[PDB]
Each structure stands twice: as C-alpha cells, then as structure tokens.
Amino acid sequence: KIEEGKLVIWINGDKGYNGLAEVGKKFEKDTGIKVTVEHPDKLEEKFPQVAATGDGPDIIFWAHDRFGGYAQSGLLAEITPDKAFQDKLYPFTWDAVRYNGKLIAYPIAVEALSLIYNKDLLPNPPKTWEEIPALDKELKAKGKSALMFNLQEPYFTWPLIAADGGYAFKYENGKYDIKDVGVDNAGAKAGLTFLVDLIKNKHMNADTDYSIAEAAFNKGETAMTINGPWAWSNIDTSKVNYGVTVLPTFKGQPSKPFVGVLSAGINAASPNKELAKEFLENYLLTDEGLEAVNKDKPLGAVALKSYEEELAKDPRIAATMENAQKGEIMPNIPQMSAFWYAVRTAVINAASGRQTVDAALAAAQTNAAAMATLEKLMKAFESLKSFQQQQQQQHQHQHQQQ
Amino acid sequence: KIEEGKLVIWINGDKGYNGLAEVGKKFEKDTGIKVTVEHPDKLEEKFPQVAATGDGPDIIFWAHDRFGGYAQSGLLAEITPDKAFQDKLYPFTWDAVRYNGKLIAYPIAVEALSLIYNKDLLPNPPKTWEEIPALDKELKAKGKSALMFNLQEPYFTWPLIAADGGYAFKYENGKYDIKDVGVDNAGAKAGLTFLVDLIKNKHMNADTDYSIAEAAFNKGETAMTINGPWAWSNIDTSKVNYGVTVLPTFKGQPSKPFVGVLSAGINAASPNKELAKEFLENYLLTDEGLEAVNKDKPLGAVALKSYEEELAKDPRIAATMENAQKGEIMPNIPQMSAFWYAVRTAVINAASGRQTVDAALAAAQTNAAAMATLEKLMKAFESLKSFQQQQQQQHQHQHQQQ
Amino acid sequence: KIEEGKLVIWINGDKGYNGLAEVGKKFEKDTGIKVTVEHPDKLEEKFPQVAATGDGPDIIFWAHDRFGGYAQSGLLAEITPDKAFQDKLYPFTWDAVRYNGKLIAYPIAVEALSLIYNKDLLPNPPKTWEEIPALDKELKAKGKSALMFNLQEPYFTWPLIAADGGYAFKYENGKYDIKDVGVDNAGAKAGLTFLVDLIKNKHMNADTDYSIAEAAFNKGETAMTINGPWAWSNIDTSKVNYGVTVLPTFKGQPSKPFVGVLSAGINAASPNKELAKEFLENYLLTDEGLEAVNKDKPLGAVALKSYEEELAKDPRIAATMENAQKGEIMPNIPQMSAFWYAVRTAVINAASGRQTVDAALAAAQTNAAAMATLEKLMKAFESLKSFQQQQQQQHQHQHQQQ
Ligand code: NA
Ligand code: NA
Ligand code: NA
Ligand code: NA
Ligand code: NA
Ligand code: NA
Ligand SMILES: [Zn+2]
Ligand SMILES: [Zn+2]
Ligand SMILES: [Zn+2]
Ligand SMILES: [Zn+2]
Ligand SMILES: [Zn+2]
Ligand SMILES: [Zn+2]
Ligand SMILES: [Zn+2]
Ligand SMILES: [Zn+2]
Ligand SMILES: [Zn+2]
Ligand SMILES: [Zn+2]
Ligand SMILES: [Zn+2]
Ligand SMILES: [Zn+2]
Ligand SMILES: [Zn+2]
Ligand SMILES: [Zn+2]
Ligand SMILES: [Zn+2]
Ligand SMILES: [Zn+2]
Ligand SMILES: [Zn+2]
Ligand SMILES: [Zn+2]
Ligand SMILES: [Zn+2]
Ligand SMILES: [Zn+2]
Ligand SMILES: [Zn+2]
Ligand SMILES: [Zn+2]
Ligand SMILES: [Zn+2]
Ligand SMILES: [Zn+2]
Ligand SMILES: [Zn+2]
Ligand SMILES: [Zn+2]
Ligand SMILES: [Zn+2]
Ligand SMILES: [Zn+2]
Ligand SMILES: [Zn+2]
Ligand SMILES: [Zn+2]
Ligand SMILES: [Zn+2]
Ligand SMILES: [Zn+2]
Ligand SMILES: [Zn+2]
Ligand SMILES: [Zn+2]
Ligand SMILES: [Zn+2]
Ligand SMILES: [Zn+2]
Ligand SMILES: [Zn+2]
Ligand SMILES: [Zn+2]
C-alpha cells in the first residue's frame, strides 16, 4: 500500500542516497512534489514481500539481475522511454533491463571485473593470457608471482572461460534461450584448459580464494590481480601504486567478464508512474543528476554517455566500461541459480585434477538439471503448503465449514 | 463383460435414462436388437477400471472433459460420422469430442453459464459489465444489491477474465498448444482488475460462495446472479420471477464462459461398434430420440441443430446456447488440473487483496508448474509400486519362483 | 594416466582378447610400439570411474549402447576416418557410433536376433508370422509346438511389435527426437495384437521366459525359437540339427530386431589418439585383423564389408547380418532405460489379459514418463550429496575453517 501525489525511493545503504535525496530536493523545487529516499535494511528481500500486496516504494534501485525475478512476479511496471532517450545511454545496457521483451528498469551504473596491476612491479601489463606463464618465471626470481585472483567462485574465472566462445545462455530475439547453454563447447573447453594448465605448471594455486588474492596484492607479493571497483578503496589504503586496465586477451579474443548493472525500476503498484518517469529521465539520468549522486558515493562507470565521457578521465573507470563493453551481461533469468551451482563444481573439480576439463564441463549440464529438479520441488511443496493454509483457514475452519 | 449382438449403455443417474431406454425400445422394434440402459454408482470412476481390462458398456454418456482421460488411455473408439451428419450438429460442439485430432464421442447436450436476473427488481438487465457499479448504487437505496455470484471457483469468474483476451490454452488446427497460456496477458489482467475493483468499491463481497449467492437470489435479496441450468429448479421452487439472458459484455467484448458438452463415447473394447453408430446417429440424435430423453429429464440446450431451434422457444435454453457459442470449450487435456489450481489461487488472492492483480496472475505460472510437478510425482510412485508389485510378487517368489 | 608411446586396450573377458593381442603383436613388429590388451572385471563400470579423472585405457571395446553415456560424460574422443575408410564398413553401423552428430567409436561386430529352426522337425521355415498359427496345429498332433521364445523381455517381442511401424524414437538427421515416440501408433498396436492373439489361441504361453524357451528347443519339443548368436554353442552341445534364418515377416513387412554393435572407442584423455587410429583403422579393421580375433572367439557378423562377405559363407552369420540390416540400431540415449521399463510392463499386461492392447500401450507413455521423473530424482539427490561432500573439503571443521 503506497501513497500518491508523492514519490518514495528505495536504494541500498552503500550508495549515494544523500546525493540522490538532493536530486529529490531539486525535484520538489520544480514540481512541488516531495521525494523521500529510504535505505531500509535488506531491501532486496523486503521488496518482493511488500510489492506483492500493493505496497513498497515507487522506485527501487538494485542490480539488474535481481529485477528479472521482480518482473517475473509482476512487481515492476513497463517503462516507456522514447527512441531519443534510449540513445542517451549505452545501447548494451538496455539489454540488461529487458524482461519478456518489455523494458522494466532504467540502467544507472555499470559494474565489471578489470585487470589490476602493480605499477612498481610491472610497468607494462600483459595484453594476452598466453604471455603470463613467461612473466611468472621472471617474477619468481624476485620472490614474487605474476597473477593471483579468486579461483573458488566461477564469477572470477569466467572472464577467461568465456573468452574463446563460452556463454551462459544464448541471448537473441530479446530473450534467453534456456536450451542453448554454452558451458562445454570448444571455446569454454580451451578457456578452462588454460586455467588448469596454469595451476599444474605452478603459475597459480588452486586454493587461492578472494581473501588470499586481495591480501597478496595489497602486500606487494603479486604483480597482478582480477577484481571489481568494490576493491579499489582497500588498495588505496595499502598505499600500493596500482593501475586498472583492460583484461588480457585469450586466443586473440577479449576476456568476457560478467556485467552487472545498477538499475531503477518502477513499482507496478505505484500510482505515480508518470512522476517516476519524469524524475528518472529528466532529473536523475542527466549530467547534473548523476553528479550529485556520484559526489556522495562514486557510482563507478555510468549508463549515461554524456556523463560517462566525463568520469572516463579516471583511467580506472574507463577500464571498467571497456571490459564491460567487451563482456557478457549477467542473465536475469531464474535458471542462473543452476548455472552457478554447476560451473562452481566444474571449475573446482577441473582445477583440483579430480576431473578432466572435458568430463567436468560435461557434468555441468547434468548437474544443472539436478538443481532445476530441486528448485522445482521447492516450488512444488511451497505451493502445497500455501494451498493447505489457503483452504483450511481462509475458507472452512473448524468452527465453520467449506 | 459383453457380447456380439446386443448393446449396453451407461448414463448417469441424474439424466433421462428412462427416456433413453424408450429410444432403445424403438431401436429394438426396427432392428430386433435389445438395448439395455444402466446407471451404476460412480460410473465415471468405474469406466476406466473395467474398460481397461476389456469390459464395461458399449456406449458411455458423460461430460466431454472426462473423455480426454479415457481417450488418453485408449478406452474410446474413433467414431466415423460423414460430412453430412457433421453438419447436423453445431460445428463448435465437435471440437469438444476431439482428442489427438480424431473424433472420439458424439455431442448430445450443451451446458454453460448464463446471467440470471430478477424480473420484478430489474426488468431490463444490463448488457455491459461497466454499468453494474452504477446499477448497484440505485439498488442499495432499496436495501438490495445488483449482483451476487460465486467468487470462490474460477469457473464462475472466468467469463469476465476471458472477455478482453484471456485464455487457458491456444486452440488451433484441432490441437491445444500447452506452451501457449493466456492467464497473464493484458486481456485477462483487465478482466480480473474489474472484478477486484467491484469488491473494493463494496459492490461485491470477496467471500461470496455458491451457497450464499443462490440463497440470496432465491430470497430476492440480489437482483442478478450467474449460474447454469443445473440451478433453475431451485429458483422455480422459490416462486421468484426470474429470467435467463446473455452474460454482460466487458469492454464491448462478450463474456466467454466454459462450455461443458454431454457426450456419448463408444468403448474401444466394444464388439458392437457398428451398432452403436447406427443407434447414436439414426435413432438418438434425431428430434424424436432427444425428445424421449428430454421428457424424462430436461437435456438443457442440445447439440443437434434441428431439435435445438425447437427448444430455443424456451428463452432460457436459447440463452444457455447463446452464451455457449460466445464462449470457449472446456479443454479435455490433462494440463487442466493444474490450470484450475493456479487460477483458483490467483483469483482468491486478487479478491482478498493478498496479491495485486498483476502479481496474482504472475504467480499462476509458478503454481501451475508446482501442480504439474507433484502430479508427476504421483504417477512416478504409482508406477514404481505397480512395478515392484508384479516384479517382486506376481513374478519371482518363494513357491515356483524364480 | 596411461602413458605415451605405448597403447593399452580394454576388452571384455568373453571376447577374443588373445587374438586381439596377436594384432597388437603385429603392430609392435611393424611400428615398434607395444600394445597391451587388458580384460578387467566389470570394466563397463570401471571405465567411467577412471576415465573421468584422466586415467584408463587408450582404447575401450564395448557394445555401442553404453558408449553414448561415455560420450555424454566427454570420456570419448572424436574419431576421424576419411570418406574412403567409412565406405569400408556398412553405412548403417556408422549410425551406431554417433553421438551429438560426432563419430565416437569404430564399429567392430554386429549382433541381432534371428529365427532359429529345428531342421528335422521343420525343413522349410515360415517366411511370415501369419502362417505360424496354422503351423502349430500340425505340430500339436505330433506332440510338439511351432514356436517358443522369451516373452518376458521386450527385446525379444519387439521385432514383431516394431514390424508394422513401431519404433523407440525417430532416428532422422543423425539425432534422436525424444518427443516422437512410436509405441502407441497403429503399427505397434497390430504387432502386439498378433502376439496377444497367439497366446489367446494357446499357440504360445504368456509365462514363457528365456530358460523355458531354450530348454524346450534344445530337447526338441519345439520347432522354432528366436535368439541371438550367443546361444548357438548351447544348441551345438545338444546335438540338435538346427538352422539360423531371416525372421518371419508381419503384414508383408520385415521383423525389426534391435542391433548391438561391438565398438572400439578412444579415450579422450589418451595421449596416443594418433596411434590408436593407426592401430584400429589399418591393423584391426582389415581382413587379417578381425580374423585373428575371430579365431580366438567368434565375433559374429562384422562391420567390415570385405571380411563380412567371407564370413557370410556361414549360413548363420549371413542371417545375423540380414536380420540386423532390416532391423534398427538400438538408441544410445539415456531415455532407453525408461523405454524398456514401460514396454516390458505393457507386453506383460497385454499377454496376461490384465489390459487390452490399446490400454497397455497407452499406459506405456505415462509409465515411461514415470521412470524418467524417478531417474532425474535419483540424479538430483546424488548431486546434492556430492555438494555436501564438496562443501566439507573446502570447508570448516575441527581441523581447519573457511
Ligand atoms: Na516506505
Ligand atoms: Na538461433
Ligand atoms: Na573494474
Ligand atoms: Na557521445
Ligand atoms: Na593417424
Ligand atoms: Na580462506
Ligand atoms: Zn539503513
Ligand atoms: Zn543488504
Ligand atoms: Zn621507477
Ligand atoms: Zn610454464
Ligand atoms: Zn559536469
Ligand atoms: Zn558540473
Ligand atoms: Zn550536481
Ligand atoms: Zn470462533
Ligand atoms: Zn450387463
Ligand atoms: Zn443407480
Ligand atoms: Zn468439466
Ligand atoms: Zn449418413
Ligand atoms: Zn462505485
Ligand atoms: Zn483454425
Ligand atoms: Zn484459427
Ligand atoms: Zn498464441
Ligand atoms: Zn470479505
Ligand atoms: Zn457458506
Ligand atoms: Zn425411426
Ligand atoms: Zn422437431
Ligand atoms: Zn418435435
Ligand atoms: Zn421415428
Ligand atoms: Zn414433439
Ligand atoms: Zn469463440
Ligand atoms: Zn494429470
Ligand atoms: Zn519372497
Ligand atoms: Zn510369503
Ligand atoms: Zn605388416
Ligand atoms: Zn580379467
Ligand atoms: Zn544393449
Ligand atoms: Zn545414414
Ligand atoms: Zn559441423
Ligand atoms: Zn489358431
Ligand atoms: Zn520427421
Ligand atoms: Zn522360469
Ligand atoms: Zn600389415
Ligand atoms: Zn531400416
Ligand atoms: Zn591451508
């Protein structure tokens, strides 16, 4: 149950909400309509609960991948920017906010992995994955290593696996074909074979996780790491002279990191859809609009062309957008759960030598089908639970009857 | 159990079985073949048990929706009426007796929802749904209400939901496409939004069932109700001056009620397949044949054109047919179990405001899949039991085993 | 691991492994590369276990139907014979060693069911199924029966069932269409009906299994039996004058038995793929190669055209190939488990009179579905316990923690 003649916005606490409120303050002075910017605890799980009944905020800010599930449940309204406003943002971002052909959210910020190198240890970072083994031997003489990054989570190893033509799901016609999985094709096989080759030649360690990767780079033990903008602040605190650049190529093809997009979606239950559109399109998604948010807490790379060109003077931001443009957009579909499950197991089992690359990737298809079944069962029994609570008490109850 | 040279017929106890026996009596005098008409308890439940082993009646009379289950199991014979006989019944009725492309039964009677109105309170019934909110306000001044009908079943509320373009399944080329579902489209959405708008504007009550509606109309508390031919006899006893007319139109589109068709199938195991065709086509499905049945217990609207024009002199029977021709035929496929489960919950949660119309219809897909899963689980274990049964017991065992 | 510059082969103990070693000995003499031929217990179970981790033989010999699973798990390398070599083997055998459109093994020997007749009791065997009822009545006057074979397993009864148009799954364009199942069609109906009618007319007994069938023919109580080459040795010992000929035709159409093709597959983890191709194509798949193996233990009908013509001078081998050439290759897909489960029960129930032919075959569709859901249930929980195991190795316990 939301209000009217006013706007209420939900954005996460680690974002520039104070700056966003100042955009809402600018909105009030022009239209006379009050904007409240709330940052409630765990709004990502709160929003599906409250919007189902017709409540919650007018606008919600979150990563696009979670919006797929909101649109599935009919919680988000179809946004209607004209052709001219769509040319204002980078074309690829709009694909991240599409569900069932319809547009469901406005892209705000773009997030992806880049290659972070130590400038003092390595002044000219490698442009290819293939020249890293040769670089490791040269650094091992100085008591250092070439590259250390998280190998436990498929999110970090995917950029290399996807390089030569591996994909999560095929995206064409504006939809993801769930019968077209690209986990054990020729390109993903070569990608992961290179990773396993790096481990059995002792150029990397299969035990390396996020904490070990970060700690190593910030202490100056390793020349390179692979990480997102979320980690820049901690590297700043270590006093390490670092640079952020384009990811290394593999077989001449660029690394394809997953692209995450911070998006603004309109609650389908909102009586202020016309107002939200006016706010987002003409007050927020403008140079002056994003600037207020960015000065509170940096947005990183942004969807708006005109303002991205301005931030891109920071070479670390330019590198985020470059790797993003060369990358795969994170699929917003529910099948993505089964994907992480299968690929996490596949990478772990290949890297440990417990399974061949070929057999580990082949097992992913059967392992993801297994997860599907478990979720299918979860949904089935949750439904039966609700059904019983629906009929026993809602209708006939001991002390009334059907 | 059966023979060659005689016919045995199953028809439900609440039908005109004596009148059917009269048609069998006329059949015996012209061809010299004795026809028995039986009406056993739970014959709809018994038929699949005895027909599977090769027994049961030569002909079974039941609603067409249950015939899909019989044809799936191969208990029904493919009927062969020529083009000339197919023009004798209403074209749309043949679609009810079609499973897997082939015709499997003869259409006898047609049954559908109609608008029943109190003539004393409302001489000119509304032609549109849009004018019922305003019509309720006038009647509330006299302590009465405009419309009260069952909202607990989706069968009664579907007419409105399907009006603007909602559909259960797409029907083309004589086949249902189970991938093409229309519960979550703009048409179904608008229809259900109007139903919910009526309840929150206090024109209708969210908890109105079949009992509460029938008793209110028959006492003269409400001006209109929605119900089928099965309920007329109860209104007759109440002395209420009532009429039966076409359902109100929504957005200029007609309400589309589901159409049940009383049908006569021929057993697959029947050695009298030719005799059953002669009896059903040239003796029962004539003006004389249906008359004898109709005078024992009213058939409602009939499939045969010639005899329907005769019955349509009764304004109630003409309206049952009119609503049936404007509505969609009840699908006989097994995916219909899950459809009802999902839609029942979708409507209830929309009516009670636990879920917004958009969100309530979105969850339908999820609940239809849930019922498919735990339905598939039932067949899984049923099969496994039958297996270990014949395998372990019927076969290898202590005495002359293995 | 298997080493390099050496070749190691796995073949079942009941095949001519010594003769294969002779070919290995010849390979060693021309090229200087030693070939070991191991015959481990239960290899068909061991191979998936060891080849997954990268160990196992360089070459494995097994029936093609098990290879589809090995290819699914990516344990088999794609073989590369040129057009000129593929003409050397019977075109239909290449369809047995195909998975995902890729060739994954070399065809060695063909195995299929044949009609075996007693010469002393029946000098001229029936060419058609239709005359067998009449032929049984002539033999019951002499205290004998016309035909006795295993009716408990669908493998044996299928030839008759498939003849008029029955099929497991449609094999077109190289792939198997799972949605197109030919168990419930008119052809399979008629086949099973004839079988059921044979039992109903006391020409065969529904309780007749493999052991009863073989013992009766080997004692000389029955004129005909249906069985493969695997049983010839037992008939030889009984001193019975027997012949092996083409299966009887049903409705002028040939009986379609399932074809088993013994095959040589190269391990995907083999560092000797080039050497295995040299060995198999130029040393084994030649007149002298197969002869060496055949003299140790008869291969039956072979895949190689040249050596097959030479073997066809044996009337029994010519028939095995003839019946195989008119029959169908047994699908190498996982869905075959559920097919056997369904059809086995279908035929059992039709033979016993528990269900009509129509009702029995109709239930096979739902029974096959039930087994599939059972199977993907087994797989789901197997991957869940693997996940729980994998978690620990990564995980926290009283030896260490995250
Ligand atoms: Na709020
Ligand atoms: Na395509
Ligand atoms: Na970055
Ligand atoms: Na520009
Ligand atoms: Na070669
Ligand atoms: Na750790
Ligand atoms: Zn907070
Ligand atoms: Zn949070
Ligand atoms: Zn320097
Ligand atoms: Zn190296
Ligand atoms: Zn600026
Ligand atoms: Zn500025
Ligand atoms: Zn500003
Ligand atoms: Zn109470
Ligand atoms: Zn009887
Ligand atoms: Zn009765
Ligand atoms: Zn019904
Ligand atoms: Zn006619
Ligand atoms: Zn009103
Ligand atoms: Zn049409
Ligand atoms: Zn049409
Ligand atoms: Zn459609
Ligand atoms: Zn209420
Ligand atoms: Zn009640
Ligand atoms: Zn007559
Ligand atoms: Zn008449
Ligand atoms: Zn008349
Ligand atoms: Zn007459
Ligand atoms: Zn009359
Ligand atoms: Zn229509
Ligand atoms: Zn069902
Ligand atoms: Zn026992
Ligand atoms: Zn016992
Ligand atoms: Zn030689
Ligand atoms: Zn051995
Ligand atoms: Zn087999
Ligand atoms: Zn071919
Ligand atoms: Zn190709
Ligand atoms: Zn006979
Ligand atoms: Zn086809
Ligand atoms: Zn036995
Ligand atoms: Zn040679
Ligand atoms: Zn063929
Ligand atoms: Zn440790």
Side-chain angles (χ1 to χ4, degrees), chain A residues 51-54 72-75 268-269 376-377 379-380 383-384 387 390 394-395, chain B residues 152 341 345 348-349 352 354-356 358-359 362 365-367 369-370 373-374 377:
Chain A
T53 66
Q72 225 317 300
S73 308
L75 309 167
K376 207 94 273 193
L377 282 165
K379 268 123 74 193
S383 175
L384 214 280
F387 172 64
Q390 194 127 110
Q394 192 142 39
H395 264 316
Chain B
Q152 312 316 298
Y341 177 65
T345 313
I348 293 312
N349 286 151
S352 76
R354 292 189 78 216
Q355 285 188 320
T356 63
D358 284 21
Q365 187 197 210
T366 317
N367 284 318
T373 293
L374 85 216
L377 271 247

Side-chain angles (χ1 to χ4, degrees), chain A residues 314-367:
Chain A
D314 185 351
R316 307 173 303 159
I317 289 162
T320 307
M321 179 64 70
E322 192 184 342
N323 283 311
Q325 283 177 108
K326 281 175 173 166
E328 189 175 344
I329 272 165
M330 178 77 70
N332 56 353
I333 55 162
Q335 290 85 21
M336 207 60 198
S337 334
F339 174 87
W340 292 125
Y341 177 70
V343 178
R344 197 217 223 97
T345 300
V347 170
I348 290 304
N349 287 358
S352 79
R354 203 259 197 88
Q355 285 187 327
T356 64
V357 173
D358 280 18
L361 288 171
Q365 162 175 109
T366 189
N367 215 54

Side-chain angles (χ1 to χ4, degrees), chain A residues 152 189 209 341 344-345 348-349 353-356 358-359 362 365-367 370-371 373-374 377, chain C residues 51-54 72-75 102 268-269 376-377 379-381 383-384 387 389-390 393-394:
Chain A
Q152 301 307 292
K189 232 130 76 181
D209 66 60
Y341 177 70
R344 197 217 223 97
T345 300
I348 290 304
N349 287 358
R354 203 259 197 88
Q355 285 187 327
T356 64
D358 280 18
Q365 162 175 109
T366 189
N367 215 54
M371 220 331 200
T373 311
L374 292 184
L377 282 165
Chain C
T53 110
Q72 231 315 111
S73 309
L75 314 166
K102 301 151 90 166
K376 63 164 90 81
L377 228 45
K379 234 181 284 170
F381 289 110
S383 89
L384 192 61
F387 173 75
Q389 280 180 214
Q390 100 178 203
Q393 62 121 162
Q394 287 333 324

Side-chain angles (χ1 to χ4, degrees), chain C residues 10-308:
Chain C
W10 279 13
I11 188 158
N12 205 37
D14 63 339
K15 322 284 175 181
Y17 55 88
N18 285 143
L20 182 61
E22 302 269 8
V23 185
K25 205 90 147 60
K26 181 72 195 188
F27 187 74
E28 195 191 356
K29 282 161 186 165
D30 279 358
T31 56
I33 295 146
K34 47 202 74 179
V35 178
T36 319
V37 185
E38 289 179 348
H39 58 98
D41 189 30
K42 253 162 269 157
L43 53 110
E44 76 272 26
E45 287 173 48
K46 276 184 176 69
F47 182 78
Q49 289 179 226
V50 290
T53 110
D55 311 300
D58 290 292
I59 304 172
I60 181 170
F61 282 75
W62 201 265
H64 71 102
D65 51 288
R66 196 65 169 261
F67 278 174
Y70 300 160
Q72 231 315 111
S73 309
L75 314 166
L76 296 176
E78 195 193 357
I79 63 150
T80 43
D82 62 336
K83 190 198 167 185
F85 185 82
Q86 290 177 51
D87 280 49
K88 280 274 156 74
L89 315 194
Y90 285 105
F92 88 95
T93 68
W94 288 113
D95 289 343
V97 286
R98 211 188 302 276
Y99 195 82
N100 274 308
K102 301 151 90 166
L103 301 170
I104 45 85
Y106 294 96
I108 310 298
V110 173
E111 203 173 38
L113 287 175
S114 300
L115 181 77
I116 302 157
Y117 64 98
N118 195 312
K119 280 190 172 189
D120 291 314
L121 295 167
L122 188 64
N124 303 320
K127 294 295 168 193
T128 61
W129 275 96
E130 289 87 348
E131 61 168 299
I132 301 174
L135 207 79
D136 189 62
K137 294 213 76 184
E138 295 181 70
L139 285 153
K140 284 282 168 68
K142 285 181 274 185
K144 313 281 179 178
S145 47
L147 169 70
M148 280 184 68
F149 69 104
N150 182 25
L151 306 185
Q152 306 306 293
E153 297 299 314
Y155 180 89
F156 285 87
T157 54
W158 188 256
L160 212 184
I161 292 157
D164 199 12
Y167 55 91
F169 306 99
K170 181 68 111 295
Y171 80 112
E172 288 176 305
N173 204 14
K175 233 80 164 283
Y176 273 109
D177 198 19
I178 341 282
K179 288 267 76 60
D180 199 331
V181 196
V183 187
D184 201 27
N185 65 32
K189 227 114 84 173
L192 188 55
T193 307
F194 193 83
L195 185 77
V196 167
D197 279 354
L198 280 169
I199 295 158
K200 208 171 292 170
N201 287 42
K202 293 288 97 210
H203 295 120
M204 290 193 306
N205 208 115
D207 307 339
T208 316
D209 55 58
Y210 189 82
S211 63
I212 302 167
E214 193 185 38
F217 185 83
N218 290 167
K219 283 193 281 179
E221 296 173 330
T222 182
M224 286 173 286
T225 187
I226 297 159
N227 218 327
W230 58 80
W232 296 343
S233 60
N234 279 182
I235 315 168
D236 287 310
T237 325
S238 60
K239 270 89 141 62
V240 174
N241 204 34
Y242 77 102
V244 172
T245 192
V246 71
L247 287 165
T249 68
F250 181 66
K251 284 197 194 291
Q253 312 288 327
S255 285
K256 284 156 71 75
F258 277 121
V259 183
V261 182
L262 177 72
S263 297
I266 302 161
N267 200 323
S270 172
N272 307 290
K273 294 183 184 72
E274 218 62 35
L275 298 170
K277 184 183 161 194
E278 172 71 354
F279 178 87
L280 294 166
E281 289 192 10
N282 299 321
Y283 290 77
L284 181 60
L285 280 175
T286 52
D287 284 349
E288 282 300 35
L290 300 172
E291 172 161 335
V293 187
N294 195 77
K295 285 206 284 182
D296 195 28
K297 265 108 165 185
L299 290 163
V302 290
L304 181 70
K305 284 180 184 170
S306 51
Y307 191 65
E308 173 57 27

Side-chain angles (χ1 to χ4, degrees), chain B residues 92 256 324-329:
Chain B
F92 85 97
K256 287 157 75 79
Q325 284 186 117
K326 284 184 179 187
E328 162 185 11
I329 273 181

Side-chain angles (χ1 to χ4, degrees), chain A residues 48 51-52 67-76 99-100 102 268 334 379, chain B residues 161 181-186 188-189 192-193 342-343 345-347 349-350 355-370:
Chain A
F67 282 170
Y70 297 165
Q72 225 317 300
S73 308
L75 309 167
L76 295 168
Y99 204 87
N100 276 313
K102 315 212 292 268
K379 268 123 74 193
Chain B
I161 301 159
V181 186
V183 194
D184 206 3
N185 61 33
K189 219 134 63 186
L192 188 66
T193 312
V343 177
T345 313
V347 174
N349 286 151
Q355 285 188 320
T356 63
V357 172
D358 284 21
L361 294 165
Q365 187 197 210
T366 317
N367 284 318

Side-chain angles (χ1 to χ4, degrees), chain A residues 14-43:
Chain A
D14 60 339
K15 312 287 171 179
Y17 59 91
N18 284 135
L20 179 67
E22 286 174 289
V23 177
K25 183 90 168 186
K26 185 84 180 178
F27 192 79
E28 285 186 48
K29 289 163 185 174
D30 283 4
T31 60
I33 290 143
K34 49 196 76 169
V35 178
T36 322
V37 179
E38 289 181 335
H39 57 102
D41 199 22
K42 285 178 277 173
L43 65 94

